[PDB]
Amino acid sequence: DNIEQLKSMIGNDELHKNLTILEKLILESLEKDKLKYPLLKQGTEQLIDISKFNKKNITDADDETYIIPTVQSSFHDIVKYEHLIKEQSIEIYNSDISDKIKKKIFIVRTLKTIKLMLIPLNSYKQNNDLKSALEELNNV
């Protein structure tokens, strides 16, 4: 049935739960890292919105504070965060660490995909309307 096949993509609770688990895992792996790029002193307020992010402090030196996404960050926040990740990775690049930069980039792309997949599911969970969920995906 066409309706029960569309509900699998934009109205599934199991897909919702699993996507949330993976998002939590990726964020918790981004915070407890070893290499900690993008940090402040760029635009970072007119450039990126700090009200949706989460700042932490670097130890062993009081250089600056680096940025971390949150569960409430939207899609374009993650777009800009990926821009900053890529700039900071291109800056400090050695062949010794060239295998952690790649992991960082891959999991940030995965976050960017998970947010877009979660838009229509979050729209449907509290409205129960398929056309409105698709139109919300199209809108933002």
3-state secondary structure 84-138: HHHHHHHHCCCCCCCCHHHHHHHHHHHHHHHHHHHHHHHHHHCCCCHHHHHHHHH
- CA gap 110, 97 in Å, rounded: 21
Q: Which residue has the tokens 């309307």?
A: 129
CA–CA dist 86, 88 (Å, integer): 5
Rounded CA-CA distance 131/80 in Å is 29
Residue 134, both tokens:
């698709």
The helix or strand, by DSSP H or E, that contains position 30, with its residue range, turns out to be helix 13-31
Q: Which technique was the structure solved with, according to the deposited record?
A: cryo-EM
Report the DSSP beta bridge partners of residue 54: 68
Say if residues 44 and 11 touch (Cβ distance below 8 Å).
no
